[PDB]
Design a protein around this nucleic acid. Structure first.
Ligand SMILES: [Zn+2]
Lengths: 99, 948
DNA sequence: GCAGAATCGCCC
């Protein structure tokens, strides 16, 4: 297998195994571990390939990578969690039945 | 009437002279095959840059005078490539890597191929072919040649007549042309040194034209192939056997239990290709709009020379996936190895039992001649192991794919520079800077001596190493990959050729597009007004659904009143693609000349296999050699092929009679012009050949509906019906819910995937702070109910990316439900379309040029501010809109053969769409792989080379 | 590890 096939199989495992949180930060920390600095210039066509059956997430990943690149930390999964999980610090939800 | 009869009397070719002070040398270099140190190169024939506007590609060439008072005329088209041979050092190279001519020369010899052998004379001096009063140092010289007389150019048998010069405008350059005539126009003869010859031109033709035609026939004696092609053109030898004594066979052929029959069939198939391919290439062709370079739309915004050259590099980058696929695919047309027989203990039916094989490992083996004597001794592979290792693909296999030509190899390397590298997941590799400053700078490199480490072909090979195919020695029946221009009428919507003629399926699709235009949606799916909030989003979908469902009611009520049996017609429908047989329809690249010609020769051989097998079964070889059998049998087999190969389901061609209306024509006096005088004479004329075979199309087919009857295959096609959790996120709305996410939920932190997956599992939805709960609960219930109705009914395995694709999916699901076709998924074709992206240069060392690199630190510094153009392919859900843009295509084909129905004993053919082999071809193909999804590579031409 | 098919033109 190519290196990009292994990154793709590892992201589909993260996304298909979460419940009761959004998945975006764990996907970003996985890409930052796998690629480091090369994330700063990751294209939409490459992001869409790596997300596999979840390629709709690509707009949200590329924005989060732009907030890391425009705020100056080194590219490691520790520094990225300290920034992302720190910069947040909200939604009111209605129940909809089924007929 | 026909294009042959309408064409005018003229010469056999022209020498063009372009002025160096004004000619756009950098533009032609981007369309050329120049290598560093070249003496000759090829360029495309194009109106406004290599020939004048209104150049006539079809002519009646004057080629013989039996006596001074009679001329004979041959109808012919021009050859597609122009050969630049005088002052050629003034055109820049396409690729900067050094040492290619010695590499090609060494590799040709280990494969046992014939090098160019020069005539014992010198080349013609400039003062013997230039117009009087032109300075030979001020001009670039090039030849344009007719397809019927190009072997006479190669062998030094044409005559140039400078007194017959004509002034022509080539773009903004004041150019001159001089006519070429065959030496048979002079019945008293001309002195032998008065004939036109150039050793560099003939050598370039040997390497870049004829060696690839020889490789497509499995012939090594390239010079003997050229002599027999010349004699076929001039002496009408199409029905005489000629290639069989040049054939060679591997041990798997010689030891086969049916060896005698197999040697006859492979020989006869190569003879039929040599008789018929030149005749179809010489035919009169239509002149495409893409031939006029000064009207190409891709220049529309350009100001000045630098802007135009940059536009040509972006054009080339969009063609690169076609060329890389023919290098990386294991089943490329460039790797076809011979013919083999299903050995009784095999799956094939009788008409499929002989088939074409591929394999680079087989292409290295030793061979035997037609009398079973030892012939070529073979090659053991690289004498020193290169960076890809033992038994793997080496740079010599890329040199073999480029026909041992430094001109073709330079242009293949230039296209390969656009490709992404893909490292293996388990192999340690140096970083790009430490390879370029380290091993690539070694004084032991045979190409660059370590003095061009960033551009060297060994550095490009090292970067792309894991994308090359395996080296194969097996004998399996696989599809092979072809490249070229598409034809006018392609049927690639979801039901293909269903109700194409009689309202029709094409009219149904046009009626749907008109209803969507009245809702404010265009043919590519762009809106005139985007939705403001939850209500508009729902209303947009309900109005599109109501438009589709009204058109279904009219169409079904038509089928009722007209009594059409459409339930049966759905079961038998096919996707249909046309591969064009016009050599002038091909894209403006000299590599596409080789890919078109070799695609055509391969298809003719494959069509002939059952035709030859049946004739030899009725007329057996009895231990005669193929040459001695063909001596009695070939004239009958030519007549059988013409009847049985054409209009039987793959190849279409028309025969035409060529007539000239006047008994005389106004021409220059050639006996006066040879002595320097110009005046008109009315020469009596007649045709030398009356019959022409105009090629039309090759047809590629793919079945849509699975009937259940083959019970072995069902698990690849079966439609599930149970409620899944992924029903919203893999349903019809998810891409639209993501596009409009910020208009729908203005100030949330949640992703669209998580918001809707949370509603799927937990039945809860967030309500935006200023909005109202009713309006959001209505949005949630609209998405849910619609997503379950799609889950229960859908047989088209697509998630739609635009409102036109959404509406067409809804329409075709409603037709299939009326037919009862709701238990299986249908077959799909997807287009892989090129996309061009600018990226940081660090992993693309070719941007540094022929520069020295002293350290990995200096490489990083030198690349820090630079960028490279690279290309990747995107999958399209909608091949139909791409086919309207007249695309260049690359696809895999197998020609299957079968008996007719109802006791019709005749052999019929279908060219079925197949699969790509080799993991390096494209990342979108990576996981047979699918029975129900197939792929085609496509690049559009409308809005690039042809105006809308 | 990759259906089955008697064929041509017609084309908006
Ligand atoms: Zn080198």
């Amino acid at each position: 297998t190519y290196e990009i096939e292994n990154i793709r199989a590892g992201l589909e495992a993260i996304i298909s195994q979460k419940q009761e949180e959004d998945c975006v930060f764990d996907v970003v920390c996985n890409l930052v571990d796998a690629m480091g600095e090369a994330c700063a210039s990751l294209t939409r066509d490459d992001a869409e390939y790596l997300l596999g059956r979840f390629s709709v997430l690509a707009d949200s990943v590329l924005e989060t990578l732009a907030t890391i690149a425009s705020s100056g930390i080194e590219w490691t999964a520790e520094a990225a969690r300290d920034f992302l999980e720190g910069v947040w610090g909200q939604d009111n939800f209605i129940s909809v039945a089924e007929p | 009437d026909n294009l042959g009869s309408q064409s005018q009397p003229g010469p056999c070719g022209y020498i063009y002279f372009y002025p160096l002070a004004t000619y756009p040398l950098r533009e032609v270099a981007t369309l050329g095959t120049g290598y560093a140190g070249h003496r000759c190169l090829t360029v495309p024939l194009l109106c406004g840059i290599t020939v004048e506007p209104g150049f006539s590609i079809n002519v009646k060439a004057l080629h013989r005078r039996p006596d001074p008072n009679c001329g004979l005329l041959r109808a012919t088209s021009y050859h597609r490539d122009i050969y630049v041979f005088h002052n050629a050092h003034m055109v820049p190279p396409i690729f900067e890597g050094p040492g290619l001519e010695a590499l090609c020369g060494e590799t040709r010899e280990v494969f046992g191929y014939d090098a160019y052998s020069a005539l014992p004379r010198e080349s013609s001096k400039p003062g013997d072919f230039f117009p009087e009063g032109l300075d030979p140092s001020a001009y670039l010289g090039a030849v344009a040649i007719t397809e019927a007389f190009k072997e006479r150019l190669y062998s030094g048998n044409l005559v140039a007549i400078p007194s017959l010069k004509q002034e022509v405008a080539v773009g903004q350059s004041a150019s001159v042309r001089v006519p070429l005539y065959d030496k048979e126009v002079f019945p008293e003869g001309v002195p032998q040194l008065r004939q036109f010859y150039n050793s560099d031109l003939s050598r370039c033709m040997h390497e870049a034209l004829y060696t690839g035609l020889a490789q497509a026939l499995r012939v090594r004696r390239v010079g003997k192939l050229v002599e027999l092609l010349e004699k076929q053109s001039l002496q009408d030898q199409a029905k005489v056997a000629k290639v069989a004594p040049l054939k060679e066979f591997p041990a798997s052929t010689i030891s086969h239990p049916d060896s005698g029959a197999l040697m006859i069939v492979d020989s006869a198939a190569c003879e039929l290709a040599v008789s018929y391919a030149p005749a179809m290439l010489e035919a009169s062709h239509e002149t495409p709009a893409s031939l006029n370079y000064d009207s190409w739309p891709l220049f529309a915004d350009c100001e000045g020379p630098e802007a135009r050259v940059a536009a040509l590099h972006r054009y080339n980058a969009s063609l690169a996936p076609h060329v890389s696929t023919q290098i990386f695919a294991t089943n490329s047309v460039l790797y076809v190895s011979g013919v083999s027989k299903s050995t009784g203990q095999g799956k094939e039916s009788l008409f499929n039992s002989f088939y074409m094989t591929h394999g680079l490992g087989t292409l290295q083996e030793g061979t035997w001649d037609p009398c079973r004597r030892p012939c070529f001794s073979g090659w053991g592979g690289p004498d020193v192991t290169g960076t890809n290792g033992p038994g793997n693909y080496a740079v010599e296999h890329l040199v073999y794919a480029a026909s041992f030509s430094p001109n073709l190899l330079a242009r293949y390397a230039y296209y390969l520079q656009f490709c992404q590298g893909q490292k293996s997941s388990l192999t340690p590799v140096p970083e790009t800077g430490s390879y370029v400053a380290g091993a690539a700078a070694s004084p032991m490199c045979s190409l660059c001596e370590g003095r061009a480490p960033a551009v060297c072909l060994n550095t490009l090979f090292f970067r792309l190493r894991d994308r090359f195919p395996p080296v194969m020695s097996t004998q399996r029946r696989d599809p092979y990959v072809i490249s070229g221009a598409s034809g006018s009428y392609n049927e690639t919507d979801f039901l293909g050729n269903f109700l194409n003629f009689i309202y029709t399926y094409w009219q149904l699709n046009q009626n749907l597009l008109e209803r969507l235009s009245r809702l404010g949606i265009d043919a590519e799916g762009k809106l005139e007004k985007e939705p403001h909030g939850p209500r508009d989003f729902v209303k947009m979908f309900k109005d599109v659904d109501a438009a589709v469902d009204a058109e279904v009611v009219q169409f079904m009520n038509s089928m009722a009143k007209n009594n059409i049996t459409y339930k049966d017609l759905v079961k038998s429908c096919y996707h249909v693609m046309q591969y064009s047989c016009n050599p002038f329809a091909q894209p403006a690249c000299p590599i596409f000349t080789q890919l078109f010609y070799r695609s055509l020769l391969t298809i003719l051989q494959d069509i002939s296999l059952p035709i030859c097998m049946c004739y030899e079964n009725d007329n057996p070889g009895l231990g005669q050699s193929p040459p001695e059998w063909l001596k009695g049998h070939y004239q009958t087999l030519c007549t059988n092929f013409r009847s049985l190969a054409i209009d039987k389901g793959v190849l279409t061609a028309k025969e035409a009679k060529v007539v000239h209306g006047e008994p005389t024509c106004d021409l220059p006096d050639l006996d006066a012009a040879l002595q320097g005088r110009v005046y008109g004479r009315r020469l009596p004329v007649r045709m030398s050949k009356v019959l022409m075979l105009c090629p039309r199309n090759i047809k590629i087919k793919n079945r849509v509906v699975f009937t259940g009857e083959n019970a072995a295959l069902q698990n690849s096609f079966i439609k599930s019906t149970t409620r899944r959790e992924n029903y919203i996120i893999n349903g019809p709305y998810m891409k639209f819910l993501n596009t409009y996410h910020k208009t729908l939920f203005p100030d949330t932190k949640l992703s669209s995937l998580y918001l809707w997956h949370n509603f799927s599992r937990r039945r809860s939805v967030p309500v935006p702070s200023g909005a109202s709960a009713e309006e959001y609960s209505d949005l949630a219930l609209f998405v849910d109910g619609g997503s379950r109705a799609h889950e229960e009914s859908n047989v088209i395995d697509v998630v739609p990316g635009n409102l036109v694709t959404y509406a067409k999916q809804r329409l075709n699901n409603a037709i299939l439900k009326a037919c009862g076709q709701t238990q299986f998924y249908i077959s799909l074709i997807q287009g892989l379309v090129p996309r061009t992206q600018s990226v940081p240069a660090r992993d693309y060392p070719h941007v540094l040029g022929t520069r020295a690199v002293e350290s990995a630190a200096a490489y990083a510094e030198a690349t820090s501010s630079l960028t490279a153009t690279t290309v990747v392919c995107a999958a399209t859900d909608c091949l139909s809109q791409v086919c309207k843009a007249r695309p260049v295509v690359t696809l895999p084909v197998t020609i299957n053969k079968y008996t007719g129905v109802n006791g019709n004993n005749q052999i019929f053919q279908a060219g079925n769409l197949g699969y790509f082999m080799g993991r390096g071809v494209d990342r979108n193909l990576l996981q047979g792989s699918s029975m129900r999804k197939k792929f085609v590579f496509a690049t559009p031409t409308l809005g690039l080379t042809v105006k809308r």
